[PDB]
Amino acid sequence: QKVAAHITGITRRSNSALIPISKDGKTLGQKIESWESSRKGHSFLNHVLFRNGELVIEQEGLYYIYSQTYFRFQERTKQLVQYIYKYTSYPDPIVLMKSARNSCWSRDAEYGLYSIYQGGLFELKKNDRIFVSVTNEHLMDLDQEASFFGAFLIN
Amino acid sequence: QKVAAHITGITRRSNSALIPISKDGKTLGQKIESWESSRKGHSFLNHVLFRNGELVIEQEGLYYIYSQTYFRFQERTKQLVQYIYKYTSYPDPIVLMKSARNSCWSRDAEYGLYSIYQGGLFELKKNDRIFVSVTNEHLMDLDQEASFFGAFLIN
Amino acid sequence: QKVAAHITGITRRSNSALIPISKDGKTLGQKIESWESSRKGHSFLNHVLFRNGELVIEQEGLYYIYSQTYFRFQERTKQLVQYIYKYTSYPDPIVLMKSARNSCWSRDAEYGLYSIYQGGLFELKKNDRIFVSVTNEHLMDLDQEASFFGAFLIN
Ligand SMILES: [Cl-]
Ligand SMILES: [Cl-]
Ligand SMILES: [Cl-]
Ligand SMILES: [Cl-]
Ligand SMILES: [Cl-]
Ligand SMILES: [Cl-]
Ligand SMILES: [Cl-]
Ligand SMILES: [Zn+2]
């Protein structure tokens, strides 16, 4: 038997003006599409499909979903945000998880290094599509060690 | 058969003066109590109870426990710390996991965005109570996308 | 049946000069060796061995691997990087996961608090050895609440 829990803050639609939530179903950030999915020892797929930057569910159930995104830049603040999204039978793409950083404000800032990891438990249906979207994609580093995206089914 | 490991730094009682450990069983931070636990597609409980801001264990075993807490503020540094605590048959609440950030020190800092994720594996007993506690709770953002708390049993 | 996926950025060998990748099989950072592995309620091993700072695999399969490393210091920027490495039947130690932060650049910075968590899914073989390595080890805090390393097999 599966024994698990995922509970969230009660604010369903946040009124925050800093990183505005979208009200017309528009995706925030730019979807990451340059993922590698079949290098033995580094990446794999087992009964999960990959296409168009999305992991597509074959088996309904509870999944732990996670992503790390590595922001690296050389030189005002940058808003560095990672979104994990779900498409399902619903008119809008759904933000499952959001994680945000601001770069250092000091005028002495020569460069930045901001790895953002997050993950959590979500009930998914067959043919749901999940993907990662980030602000400031031009600052993302697609180093296979530093940026990745995965999920596993919990039995 | 369950195959797993969780090993920790050897310092049992840290002598650090920056974020002092408590010596009289007093909880650090303020417990988060405004969690939502039953919105299909966003939150759920399966053989785990929720009450008084705590996840309460029904089935003894090994759990992966995690929480994300989103600090957002508009304007000295702020100590932003997330504690995951356990109550069991022990005279004190027990810190299982601690994760800390300091806000940017620059006088030019207009705002802050600090999402803190952590998680790990802990052996739990029936009726153990686990909760999340944070410093600077007034800066926490209970956006359901950004702040959450969960666990799952490992078979 | 195990249902899971882990996909990575396509850049196999990153050309970044900021945190240079190693080209002669040399390990980056210093391996953490002062882990505690058998304090009931805080740490444990179940069909995983510990020796020489490494978790050593007894059972081939898919593992979710994670580590948190807590950097704390009192006082230019510091590069704070966590590497999770694998030794297997391969001439070089293999970086599985890298996560990086830079400390605040402000000259007003009195102290720093930088907890770094990361984790992910990797297929491991029997007798593979996995460990954590960090830059600026003298700034690591081996508080058992704040710094840890674990993994579990996914069935
Ligand atoms: Cl920006
Ligand atoms: Cl880049
Ligand atoms: Cl403070
Ligand atoms: Cl707030
Ligand atoms: Cl450095
Ligand atoms: Cl900063
Ligand atoms: Cl230290
Ligand atoms: Zn700063």
Numbering used by the authors:
A (entry chain D), B (entry chain D), C (entry chain D): 124 to 198, 206 to 285
Quoted from the paper:
TRAIL (TNF-related apoptosis-inducing ligand) is a potent inducer of tumor cell apoptosis through TRAIL receptors. TNF superfamily ligands are expressed as type II transmembrane proteins and form homotrimers through their extracellular domains. TRAIL is known to bind five members of the TNF receptor superfamily. TRAIL binds HS with high affinity (KD = 73 nM) and HS induces TRAIL to form higher-order oligomers.
We determined the crystal structure of soluble mTRAIL to better compare to hTRAIL and understand the biophysical characterization of HS and mTRAIL interactions. Though a HS 12mer was present in the crystallization conditions, the oligosaccharide was not visible in the electron density. Similar to hTRAIL, mTRAIL exists as a trimer composed of three β-scaffold core protomers with one protomer comprising the asymmetric unit. A zinc ion, critical for activity, is located on the threefold axis bound by cysteine 240 from each protomer and a chloride ion. A major difference between TRAIL and other TNF family members is an insertion of ~12–16 residues between β-strands A and Aʺ known as the A-Aʺ loop. The N-terminal β-strand A of mTRAIL is found sandwiched between β-stands H and Aʺ of the neighboring protomer’s central β-scaffold core, a pattern repeated for each protomer. Clear electron density can be traced between this strand and β-strand Aʺ confirming the swapping of the N-terminal strand between the protomers. Interestingly, this swap has not been reported in other structures of TRAIL or TNF family members. To explicitly determine the HS-binding site of TRAIL, we performed site-directed mutagenesis of seven conserved lysine and arginine residues on mTRAIL, some of which (Arg119, Arg122, and Lys125) cluster (in triplicate) near the ‘top’ of the trimer and likely form the HS-binding site. Interestingly, these three residues are located at the N-terminus of the soluble TRAIL, which likely adopts a random coil structure because it was not visible in the crystal structure of soluble TRAIL.
